[PDB]
Scaffold this active site. Structure first.
Site, PDB file in Angstrom:
ATOM      1  N   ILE A  91       0.874  -1.151   0.000  1.00 59.62           N
ATOM      2  CA  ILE A  91       0.000   0.000   0.000  1.00 59.62           C
ATOM      3  C   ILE A  91       0.922   1.215   0.000  1.00 59.62           C
ATOM      4  CG2 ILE A  91      -1.227   1.367   1.740  1.00 59.62           C
ATOM      5  CD1 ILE A  91      -2.959  -0.951   2.380  1.00 59.62           C
ATOM      6  N   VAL A 143       6.195   6.710   6.718  1.00 59.36           N
ATOM      7  CA  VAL A 143       5.851   5.343   7.126  1.00 59.36           C
ATOM      8  C   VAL A 143       5.894   4.404   5.914  1.00 59.36           C
ATOM      9  CG1 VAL A 143       4.227   3.869   8.329  1.00 59.36           C
ATOM     10  CG2 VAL A 143       4.364   6.286   8.962  1.00 59.36           C
ATOM     11  N   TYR A 144       5.618   4.921   4.718  1.00 57.23           N
ATOM     12  CA  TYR A 144       5.766   4.126   3.524  1.00 57.23           C
ATOM     13  C   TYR A 144       7.207   3.604   3.416  1.00 57.23           C
ATOM     14  CZ  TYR A 144       5.716   2.435  -1.261  1.00 57.23           C
ATOM     15  OH  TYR A 144       5.786   1.601  -2.346  1.00 57.23           O
ATOM     16  N   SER A 145       8.175   4.491   3.659  1.00 61.43           N
ATOM     17  CA  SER A 145       9.579   4.212   3.419  1.00 61.43           C
ATOM     18  C   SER A 145      10.129   3.243   4.479  1.00 61.43           C
ATOM     19  CB  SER A 145      10.361   5.499   3.361  1.00 61.43           C
ATOM     20  OG  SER A 145       9.819   6.366   2.368  1.00 61.43           O
ATOM     21  N   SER A 205       8.414   0.997   6.096  1.00 57.19           N
ATOM     22  CA  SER A 205       7.788  -0.268   5.888  1.00 57.19           C
ATOM     23  C   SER A 205       8.573  -1.096   4.875  1.00 57.19           C
ATOM     24  CB  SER A 205       6.376  -0.079   5.421  1.00 57.19           C
ATOM     25  OG  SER A 205       6.337   0.260   4.043  1.00 57.19           O
TER      26      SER A 205
END
Lengths: 240, 241, 246, 241
Positions: free
Chosen positions: C96, C160-162, C164
């Site tokens: 996501i 938080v994307y990175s 993850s």
């Protein structure tokens, strides 16, 4: 139409494996090296699969930085090549203190100064020409240039300098339709092994790496158009 | 309670100046090495003395003679005297590699990588088997561009990335021999480096020039450390982030 | 030259129902792999299943409706057409993306992104690794994580994307080491910005990419095909990111 | 000479303590946060006082509780107070991934990654828009295993690599607001590592365990720096070399 690829150090091992796979993919392969006897042997073995596909010998001393820069003795102009594989490669294993100055400076000329020169010449020639596919500059580095080993100081340095070159060139020439990448072998079954051997390193994947596997990476890259500024480590988990 | 010797190439101005000062302030007996003897003596005069036993030196050395670097031709002190060698001497050239003059980049290559290899060898041949409570320090000043590529600075980045490489291997070779080996990687610093290039021309998380002093803070920290080797400190305003 | 029994290998692609997932499945299928594609949306799953080539005797594809936000389900191979022990290739593409200054970033959103991107694929991988660790082979198995260029070069508003996908990178290196002597090669393909894998306020033009524009999902599959056919590559990232990490 | 506030999670033991001590030795008002309440008082009692109106503080906290970290539940100060936050909240777990119990590795994930994200989000919220002369610092403690693969540490590695990705992004995001964000990457350190893994298992350029103080050094250096963000500072005896 049969695209032209220059592969330095195409005489043997990794360069051979590369030149073969490129010929097999329909490319007109110029190989460049000291040994002419050897070039010719290899020239005949390169598949001719696409009509118009010619191969070439270039006798070139890999420590001659004016010759490399001036394309001295090349069968084709630098303007020709859609692909250049920098595989010019000498390695030397000594503790820095014992490492002779003739050796490590020759290594450092062959592995980095000449490549730069040779690269400059190509990029001069092919920057402004049109093409739908990007052209490809691909340096054969070494695993050692990211994770340090003892007694390969100047070697590592020559190829970390290469890594540094490609990274900047990639950003510089990306708008010009030139992709620039390194392929970083680990220990390969070849003439880049005198004392040094796999076993002396605890690899996640035991044993030698064969040349043709290094080639596969080159082949993948050459066929790509979204990969620049990258190293493709084929090193049996050495840098992991 | 002795005063240890520090060698610092390019100690006559800029980063090397800021380093040499801080080293001398921490009580090192700094030798500075560079081309211009007049500029040298001016910094030697500037270097602080805060300790009996502390004694600074100058070394007139052309950074582009590898035999000279390699042999220690002109050295105040013996090679073995040095507990800290900071390889800070560098040349920077902004050019599309297509019209990069052969003599300019070949020379920059020599200054940035070839000569420091020879000099680094002299120092290592000398200080390897020496005993020492705490470990000896070789510290190269690389650059951010060695790690994140940038346009029109290929051969520059190559030479300094070459240094990064050298130092990784050396850290591994000389760890047991009691020498720690590290890089400090400055970003854009307020000096006579290249020129034309402003901190405006990159999207820096931290806007502005880096002050040479800040680089010296990294060297000072390294030299005071024991368990740090094989690493680059980045003082680059987040350029490599 | 010839053989009376040449086997089809089993490949698992999570998030294989669209975009990069879809592309990889397609490419693995055309290479002769029996592809199990897994994700929430069954219609899209079947839609792609029907498109998957069949080029080989004994090649069948499969669908696994899997809620990827479900750690337990991922871990217990709940609803899986085949047992974990079937698979010679596992491609974790489940992921996501979300964009937000960290401060405006809704807790339920980023937390769910962490589960989906890191936690559940840990669970899934464990299950595979347990089920295939000790099975004998001459060629290595492949675990491939699809990561992202943002894991290795920081960008604002993808915190938080990175994290993850960066966690996925640190996972991959550790395992490569762990499982290399068990004939399991473990790698990351790292996409830069590709069409429909980001959405909602991030695009190539915001960055001085050496190569302008979006990346076709096929480019990512090319890397994954290359790895899967490889025998000497483990613990690496293959960046396909139009020069972003350079 | 104002005393600035610093939060340090896992400030009670080992690397936490060293960090906290050295911060206080330099004048910062420290808030150490952990679950063990006797340990907090112990350490709080020992924190140096060196600066007019310097005060230390405790915050008893379950670093596995993401809502409590996120809301600063029970904390002795509001998030607004702190110019420095050192995320040393940490747990290591050695196991084959095949044998690694779900409950465990998820709890590690929560403490290593999830909770410090909630904690970081809270801090940034409450000091993002505030006006400063020196940048504030967010410093995470990572590990070397997060950048170099080692067997039986898959989720530990992963969890801290999460922290690496997080700080790189945040650096880019918050640099313009005068927040610097880096990691200190410790190698194997006395008391921090799960029993079952030790330095003898790697050909470290420098043999042995590392004292927590050497970590707290790298931190102290970052805290006092101004031009460093988006970086990892490896104190790892060259593990990652």
């Amino acid at each position: 139409p049969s695209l032209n690829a220059l592969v330095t150090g195409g005489s043997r091992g990794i360069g051979e494996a590369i030149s073969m796979q490129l010929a097999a993919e329909g490319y007109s392969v110029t190989i460049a090296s000291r040994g002419l006897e050897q070039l010719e042997a290899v020239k005949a073995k390169l598949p001719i699969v696409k009509q118009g596909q010619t191969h070439h010998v270039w006798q070139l001393d890999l420590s001659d930085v004016e010759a490399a820069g001036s394309f001295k003795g090349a069968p084709l102009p630098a303007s020709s090549y859609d692909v250049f594989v920098s595989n010019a490669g000498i390695s030397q294993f000594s503790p820095i203190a014992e490492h002779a100055d003739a050796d490590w400076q020759n290594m450092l000329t062959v592995n980095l100064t000449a490549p730069i020169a040779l690269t400059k010449a190509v990029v001069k020639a092919i920057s402004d020409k049109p093409r739908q596919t990007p052209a490809h500059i691909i340096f054969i580095s070494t695993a050692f240039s990211k994770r340090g080993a003892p007694k390969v100081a100047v070697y590592s340095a020559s190829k970390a300098g290469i890594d540094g070159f490609m990274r900047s060139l990639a950003r510089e020439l990306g708008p010009k339709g030139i992709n620039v990448n390194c392929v970083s072998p680990g220990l390969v079954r070849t003439e880049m092994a005198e004392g040094i051997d796999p076993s002396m390193f605890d690899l996640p994947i035991r044993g030698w790496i064969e040349p043709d596997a290094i080639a596969d990476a080159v082949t993948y890259l050459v066929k790509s158009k979204n990969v620049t500024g990258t190293t493709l480590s084929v090193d049996n988990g050495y840098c992991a």
